[PDB]
Amino acid sequence: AIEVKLANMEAEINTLKSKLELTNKLHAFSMGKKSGKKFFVTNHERMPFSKVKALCSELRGTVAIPRNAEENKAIQEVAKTSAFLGITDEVTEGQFMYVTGGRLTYSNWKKDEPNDHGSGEDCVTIVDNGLWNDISCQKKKTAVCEFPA
Amino acid sequence: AIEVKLANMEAEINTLKSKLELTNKLHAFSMGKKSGKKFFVTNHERMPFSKVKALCSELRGTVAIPRNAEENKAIQEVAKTSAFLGITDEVTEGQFMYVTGGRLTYSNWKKDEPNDHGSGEDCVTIVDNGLWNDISCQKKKTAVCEFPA
Amino acid sequence: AIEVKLANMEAEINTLKSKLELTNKLHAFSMGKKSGKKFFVTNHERMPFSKVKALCSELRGTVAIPRNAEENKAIQEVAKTSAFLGITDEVTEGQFMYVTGGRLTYSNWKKDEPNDHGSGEDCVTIVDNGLWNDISCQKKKTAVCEFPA
Numbered sequence: 001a002i003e004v005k006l007a008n009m010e011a012e013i014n015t016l017k018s019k020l021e022l023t024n025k026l027h028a029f030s031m032g033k034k035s036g037k038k039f040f041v042t043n044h045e046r047m048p049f050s051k052v053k054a055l056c057s058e059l060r061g062t063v064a065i066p067r068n069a070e071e072n073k074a075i076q077e078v079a080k081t082s083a084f085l086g087i088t089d090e091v092t093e094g095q096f097m098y099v100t101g102g103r104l105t106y107s108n109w110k111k112d113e114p115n116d117h118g119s120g121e122d123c124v125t126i127v128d129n130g131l132w133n134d135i136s137c138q139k140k141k142t143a144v145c146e147f148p149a
Numbered sequence: 150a151i152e153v154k155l156a157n158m159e160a161e162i163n164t165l166k167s168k169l170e171l172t173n174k175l176h177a178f179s180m181g182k183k184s185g186k187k188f189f190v191t192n193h194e195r196m197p198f199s200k201v202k203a204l205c206s207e208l209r210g211t212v213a214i215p216r217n218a219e220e221n222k223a224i225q226e227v228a229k230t231s232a233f234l235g236i237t238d239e240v241t242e243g244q245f246m247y248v249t250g251g252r253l254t255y256s257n258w259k260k261d262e263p264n265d266h267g268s269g270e271d272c273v274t275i276v277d278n279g280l281w282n283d284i285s286c287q288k289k290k291t292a293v294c295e296f297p298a
Numbered sequence: 299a300i301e302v303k304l305a306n307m308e309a310e311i312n313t314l315k316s317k318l319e320l321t322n323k324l325h326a327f328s329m330g331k332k333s334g335k336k337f338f339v340t341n342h343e344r345m346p347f348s349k350v351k352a353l354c355s356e357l358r359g360t361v362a363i364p365r366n367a368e369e370n371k372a373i374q375e376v377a378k379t380s381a382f383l384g385i386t387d388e389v390t391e392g393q394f395m396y397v398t399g400g401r402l403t404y405s406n407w408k409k410d411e412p413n414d415h416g417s418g419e420d421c422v423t424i425v426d427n428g429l430w431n432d433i434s435c436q437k438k439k440t441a442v443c444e445f446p447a
């Protein structure tokens with residue numbers, strides 16, 4: 001009995017695990033996730049960078065990062081407004097790095113940006129036409145999280 | 150070993166409960182839930198009050214209740230049309246109460262409403278402009294449920 | 299302990315099954331699923347017919363099939379642009395069948411369609427106006443999956 005009951009329960013658990021994964025797939029699909037493409041999502045709430053990082057981390061994601069023009073366009077279409085990107089030069093001025101580590105491989109700065117304006121701007125937002133502008137991390141912009149392809 | 154397998158099962162169940170809660174958190178977020186705010190959802194189906202209340206209940210929610218102007222605006226935007234609110238005066242005519250308890254505090258009544266028109270109107274709907282009107286609970290309005298903050 | 303823990307685990311698994319069921323109901327509702335009606339979902343990605351079939355099967359759904367004018371309109375609203383239907387005449391040229399088997403019980407063919415134009419057209423797409431046109435299965439159309447009522 002015992003061993004049989006246990007084996008049966010292990011079978012149910014694995015079935016439930018598959019069932020949850022299906023739920024996750026269907027959710028992503030319904031939200032527009034494209035096949036083999038990163039899933040970007042927003043609640044359309046504007047908050048300071050620290051909060052954005054906190055929120056995405058809590059959802060086990062990361063602040064959205066465009067690796068190329070294709071992803072930059074996808075992020076733009078999702079936010080529909082100015083949104084923080086997972087890129088900052090907080091650690092070392094002038095040297096932008098992804099919040100997940102690494103230096104920039106792709107950028108789409110606006111005319112005369114980055115300018116580290118005034119007191120200093122260490123964060124980055126994707127604005128009009130998907131162009132970038134560095135801004136104060138304390139400002140409040142749309143939170144856009146990223147999930148695996 | 151039976152105990153090793155049992156210990157693994159506890160870990161599997163725990164891992165699963167955590168993943169399921171993450172799936173719930175991501176869904177809410179993707180549905181527009183703002184941090185520390187209750188969120189509203191609708192399938193855009195029109196139905197009499199009894200069915201909205203029942204439906205929201207089986208989803209572990211409640212028929213939408215605007216506790217203030219911000220929330221009133223949030224419900225209006227989600228609903229897009231006339232929707233039932235979780236407010237009625239079925240228990241004592243003239244005394245509006247929340248479906249979950251308590252006397253109505255914040256209100257956004259239209260001019261000359263509530264009027265318990267004709268044979269009577271005990272339910273409440275939020276109309277296109279966000280104002281409220283009391284109506285028959287048998288009328289079919291959009292089903293909007295709210296889930297805790 | 300062993301038998302007590304084993305019994306509790308059974309209770310834990312059943313509780314999780316109920317929770318996931320609920321998560322599934324809430325998601326369907328959030329996506330506009332109406333009571334007693336099938337629901338169609340799309341990520342708005344264009345792909346060849348074989349890919350749509352593969353994707354819907356992976357979501358445990360089927361490629362969208364309109365059984366009447368109501369569902370035909372429903373699918374059209376969801377897709378927003380030309381999408382594949384789960385109908386093809388791949389088995390026997392001229393004999394359109396559901397991907398789920400059987401002859402069509404309802405059709406909305408545009409004038410002089412289906413015509414197996416040129417090199418051949420064995421798949422079907424619901425155009426922007428709801429009418430049907432048979433087209434090449436290799437063309438990229440919007441993926442719309444169907445789930446039961």
Ligand SMILES: CO[C@@H]1O[C@H](CO)[C@@H](O[C@@H]2O[C@H](CO)[C@H](OS(=O)(=O)O)[C@H](O)[C@H]2O)[C@H](O[C@@H]2O[C@@H](C)[C@@H](O)[C@@H](O)[C@@H]2O)[C@H]1NC(C)=O
Pocket residue numbers: 260261262264266267268270282283284285288
């Ligand atoms: C003079 O005051 C107005 O008189 C109208 C005619 O009696 C009222 O409208 C009627 O309301 C009926 C509801 O009992 C019914 O409406 S329903 O179909 O929407 O249920 C009648 O068809 C309708 O003519 C009017 O009531 C207000 O507008 C109605 C459309 C309805 O929304 C009511 O709930 C409103 O109170 C009434 N207006 C006022 C301000 O007294």
Ligand SMILES: CO[C@@H]1O[C@H](CO)[C@@H](O[C@@H]2O[C@H](CO)[C@H](OS(=O)(=O)O)[C@H](O)[C@H]2O)[C@H](O[C@@H]2O[C@@H](C)[C@@H](O)[C@@H](O)[C@@H]2O)[C@H]1NC(C)=O
Pocket residue numbers: 388389417418420
């Ligand atoms: C019922 O099974 C399916 O029948 C279809 C109709 O015959 C097959 O498609 C046809 O395949 C032909 C070659 O066999 C030819 O395609 S080709 O030009 O690419 O050669 C016809 O134009 C085409 O309509 C279908 O075959 C499969 O799909 C084809 C598009 C092609 O990729 C073939 O290699 C495939 O086998 C066939 N499906 C299967 C799974 O056999």
Ligand SMILES: [Ca+2]
Pocket residue numbers: 089090092093120121122
């Ligand atoms: Ca700096």
Ligand SMILES: [Ca+2]
Pocket residue numbers: 089090093094116120121122123134
């Ligand atoms: Ca800087």
Ligand SMILES: [Ca+2]
Pocket residue numbers: 113114115116117121133134135
């Ligand atoms: Ca700047």
Ligand SMILES: [Ca+2]
Pocket residue numbers: 238239241242269270271
């Ligand atoms: Ca009354």
Ligand SMILES: [Ca+2]
Pocket residue numbers: 264265266267
């Ligand atoms: Ca009166």
Ligand SMILES: [Ca+2]
Pocket residue numbers: 238242243265269270271272283
């Ligand atoms: Ca009344």
Ligand SMILES: [Ca+2]
Pocket residue numbers: 262263264265266270282283284
């Ligand atoms: Ca009234």
Ligand SMILES: [Ca+2]
Pocket residue numbers: 387388391418419420
């Ligand atoms: Ca053919």
Ligand SMILES: [Ca+2]
Pocket residue numbers: 417418419
């Ligand atoms: Ca051919």
Ligand SMILES: [Ca+2]
Pocket residue numbers: 387391392414418419420421432
């Ligand atoms: Ca054909």
Ligand SMILES: [Ca+2]
Pocket residue numbers: 411412413414415419431432433
């Ligand atoms: Ca054709």
Ligand SMILES: [Cl-]
Pocket residue numbers: 120121122123135136137138
């Ligand atoms: Cl800064």
Ligand SMILES: [Cl-]
Pocket residue numbers: 269270271272284285286287
């Ligand atoms: Cl009533």
Ligand SMILES: [Cl-]
Pocket residue numbers: 418419420421433434435436
């Ligand atoms: Cl074809």
